């Protein structure tokens, strides 16, 4: 009874600590490799740095908070931090998928008008693009949350909003659909649509240089595909639950959210496809 709980708490505390360490170490390595290797300071890698910041925030704030909730079975931190934590969760996933759209659009431009690209894309514009993405993402995530537009009137829901040990994200139907569409489904459709024209135009292209470029492209495609596989299950279930809760078991819904958090560990591993990253990772790890 109490032993079963101690076994589970200690083992789960260790797994969680591992997850945190893998997300934080991996994304610090990405940022530090790009921030200290001139060869990696391309405009595209500025967008990768943005993505690695989203993941880093997941590692430092989102996951540790969720960990205390999984290990201890209740929300220990009070109402404000529950709401902030929820905000940072919505923020990070929104910023991630919006950044992946920008990355897809950047490559589309570079591949179809190399010259217009050259004279349009500057470091100063890349910065504005990145801040614009975070501004929109901030807007879409914080405001409806801090303004309580996600709240429901259901007796279960009010039960939780009254309990300071409860931080379930129990939302009304309107918010679930809307935030899903605005945070996820619309950017997903854009990214897929653009990534496909990228594929088409890449196939419509000395040989060594085109191969190195297509390897990098494929890396970006893998980033985009893994992200979709890690988060789509949760957002599918998020919709389906709006119509009929029973059709998908609860434990699964929380697992799918954790699948989403876990994506924050994956990119640094995926970047090891690149000789340049691999070299800088080795050099940095000393
Ligand atoms: C608790 C949460 C809400 C923190 C959110 C932090 C954001 C405001 C971060 C996340 C991504 C960061 C950006 C990621 C990348 C860049 C590129 C960077 O370009 C450079 O001039 C130097 C980088 C290089 O060339 O190696 C300028 C800062 C900026 C816009 C960063 C500014 C701060 C941003 C938007
Ligand atoms: C809220 C959801 C439904 C919108 C998701 C769409 C975004 C993922 C993408 C699609 C097109 C992107 C935009 C395409 C072009 C630009 C221009 C870009 O560059 C500049 O304006 C710099 C120009 C300068 O000041 O010199 C600023 C970012 C922005 C708005 C991008 C921000 C992100 C957008 C809106
Ligand atoms: C939760 C994240 C939310 C991100 C907030 C984004 C706000 C919009 C971006 C913005 O305000 N700037 C673009 C950023 O480049 C202005 C900056 O340029 C600013 O620092 C200026 O005061 C300097 O340019 C003065 O030299
Ligand atoms: C970018 C996302 C922005 C989403 C904005 C959604 C705001 C929707 C407001 C709203 O619909 N409610 C108030 C919330 O402020 C209440 C109802 O949704 C609900 O509580 C009850 O009427 C139930 O009985 C279900 O019909
Ligand atoms: C496109 C805008 C249509 C609005 C979509 C709202 C979906 C609400 C459907 C719903 O609540 N149920 C599905 C009913 O089949 C379950 C109810 O029966 C219980 O309250
Ligand atoms: C309170 C109820 C929620 C309890 C469910 C918590 C699951 C623990 C989350 C976790 O860290 N992982 C399981 C994910 O659920 C391990 C991740 O590292 C994993 O996602 C990937 O590395 C694998 O897919 C590779 O096989
Ligand atoms: C913070 C919240 C809770 C996740 C959670 C809950 C319990 C746990 O034990 C572990 C994780 N997740 C929000 C996910 C979300 C992200 C984006 C959206 O648009 C949306 O509607 C919902
Ligand atoms: Na509560």
UniProtKB/Swiss-Prot annotation:
UniProt keyword Ubl conjugation, yes or no: no
Membrane topology: Multi-pass membrane protein
Residue ranges of the TM segments: 7-35, 45-71, 84-105, 124-147, 174-199, 214-243, 249-271
Extracellular side: 72-83, 148-173, 244-248
Keyword terms of this UniProt record: Cell membrane, Disulfide bond, Endosome, G-protein coupled receptor, Glycoprotein, Lipoprotein, Membrane, Palmitate, Phosphoprotein, Receptor, Transducer, Transmembrane, Transmembrane helix
Binding site for cyanopindolol: 89, 179, 257
Entry keyword annotation includes Protease: no
UniProt modification remark: Homologous desensitization of the receptor is mediated by its phosphorylation by beta-adrenergic receptor kinase.
Listed GO CC annotations: early endosome; membrane; plasma membrane
GO molecular function: beta1-adrenergic receptor activity; identical protein binding
Disulfide bonds: 82-167, 160-166
GO biological process, one term: positive regulation of heart contraction
Membership in a protein family: Belongs to the G-protein coupled receptor 1 family. Adrenergic receptor subfamily. ADRB1 sub-subfamily.
Protein name, per record: Beta-1 adrenergic receptor
Name of the gene encoding the protein in the UniProt record: ADRB1
Residue span relative to the full protein: 33 to 358 of 483
């Amino acid at each position: 009874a109490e032993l079963l709980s101690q076994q589970w708490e200690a083992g789960m505390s260790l797994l969680m600590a591992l997850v945190v360490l893998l997300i934080v170490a991996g994304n610090v390595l990405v940022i530090a490799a790009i921030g200290s290797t001139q060869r990696l300071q391309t405009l595209t890698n500025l967008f990768i740095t943005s993505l690695a910041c989203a993941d880093l925030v997941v590692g430092l704030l989102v996951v540790p908070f969720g960990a205390t909730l999984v290990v201890r079975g209740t929300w220990l931190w009070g109402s404000f931090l529950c709401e902030l934590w929820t905000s940072l969760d919505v923020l990070c996933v929104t910023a991630s998928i919006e950044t992946l759209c920008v990355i897809a659009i950047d490559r589309y431009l570079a591949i179809t008008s190399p010259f217009r690209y050259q004279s349009l894309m500057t470091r100063a514009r890349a910065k504005v693009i990145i801040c614009t993405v975070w501004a929109i993402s901030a807007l879409v995530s914080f405001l409806p949350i801090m303004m309580h537009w996600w709240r429901d009137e259901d007796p279960q829901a009010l039960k939780c909003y009254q309990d300071p040990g409860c931080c379930d994200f129990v939302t009304n139907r309107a918010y679930a659909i809307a935030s899903s569409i605005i945070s996820f489904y619309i950017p997903l459709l854009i990214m897929i649509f653009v990534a496909l024209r990228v594929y088409r135009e890449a196939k419509e292209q000395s040989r060594v240089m085109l191969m190195r470029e297509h390897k990098a492209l494929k890396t970006l495609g893998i980033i985009m595909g893994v992200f979709t596989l890690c988060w789509l299950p949760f957002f599918l279930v998020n919709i389906v639950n709006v119509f009929n809760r029973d059709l998908v078991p609860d434990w699964l819904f929380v697992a799918f959210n954790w699948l989403g958090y876990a994506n924050s560990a994956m990119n640094p591993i995926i970047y090891c496809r690149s000789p340049d990253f691999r070299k800088a990772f080795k050099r940095l790890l000393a």
